[PDB]
Ligand binder design. Structure first.
Ligand SMILES: CCN(CC)C(=O)[C@@H]1C=C2c3cccc4[nH]c(Br)c(c34)C[C@H]2N(C)C1
Length: 263
């Protein structure tokens, strides 16, 4: 079951890589931010998920060297954060595009896309900047009874608040403002509302339980909490596996590209 998620991740990300890099009609500023998101989930699907499957297969005892535990957790907080701020920036851009379309089109450029990519990756690197320089030289953030689990309450609580919950409330405000703003064109607006709702509720359903139970594991019968964490982390990874699909399949050109490249 676990091996299915890794394969789905690599395939669904390589498909959008090939669809944006080898299709003239889809070379746009928005498709390049989607390209960056796909790159983030692509790296997450190879540098993290195989190692997580290895940990599940072996158990808590980890055959890889203890020195390597610090950087493998650093990649999780790097790539998963990067994807989360990618989604947050996409929602903000959609709100600017739907609420004020003339001005968005006036300000739309490739420079804005590069600025967005630089900003989200800078923020992701900054949030995960404590862990390697505080974890390689000690056991504070890297180890807890031979589990290779992030065991720093100062960073688990504070880190999640900036990495997930600030983006989460930004996304909820953005969704409520957009759906309050889209109220032949009427059917298009209804389909846009449908897509926005589906995407937002997928992201919330798939990432919210992990961080809630992670906070509860620190504030708070922890044996069941450990297993729930161990399942919801994989749910979170499956979200990054899915995200390239739902953000692109609705577009006709992307759907045709996936139909053709799969042949
Ligand atoms: C190494 C695997 N692992 C052990 C089960 C984890 O807990 C990993 C730790 C994580 C974490 C902790 C704190 C703040 C955070 N922000 C973001 Br985004 C993440 C995060 C991603 C999250 N990923 C999915 C699991």
């Amino acid at each position: 079951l676990t091996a299915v998620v890794i394969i789905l991740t690599i395939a669904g990300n390589i498909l959008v890589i090939m669809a944006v890099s080898l299709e003239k009609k889809l070379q746009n500023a928005t498709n390049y931010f989607l390209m960056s998101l796909a790159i983030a989930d692509m790296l997450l699907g190879f540098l993290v998920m195989p190692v997580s499957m290895l940990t599940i297969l072996y158990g808590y005892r980890w055959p890889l060297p203890s020195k390597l535990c610090a950087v493998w957790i650093y990649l999780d907080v790097l790539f998963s954060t990067a994807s989360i701020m990618h989604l947050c920036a996409i929602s903000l851009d959609r709100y600017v595009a739907i609420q004020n379309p003339i001005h968005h089109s006036r300000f739309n450029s490739r420079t804005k896309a590069f600025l967005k990519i630089i900003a989200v990756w800078t923020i992701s690197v900054g949030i995960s900047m404590p862990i390697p320089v505080f974890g390689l030289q000690d056991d504070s953030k890297v180890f807890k009874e031979g589990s290779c689990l992030l065991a720093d309450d100062n960073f688990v609580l504070i880190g999640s608040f900036v990495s997930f919950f600030i983006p989460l409330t930004i996304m909820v405000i953005t969704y409520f403002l957009t759906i309050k703003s889209l109220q032949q064109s009427i059917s298009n607006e209804q389909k846009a509302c449908k897509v926005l709702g589906i995407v937002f509720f997928l992201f919330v359903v798939m990432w919210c339980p992990f961080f809630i139970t992670n906070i509860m594991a620190v504030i708070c019968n922890e044996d069941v909490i450990g297993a729930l964490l161990n399942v919801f982390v994989w749910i979170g990874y499956l979200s990054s596996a899915v995200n390239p699909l739902v953000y692109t399949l609705f577009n006709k050109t992307y759907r045709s590209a996936f139909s053709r490249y799969i042949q």
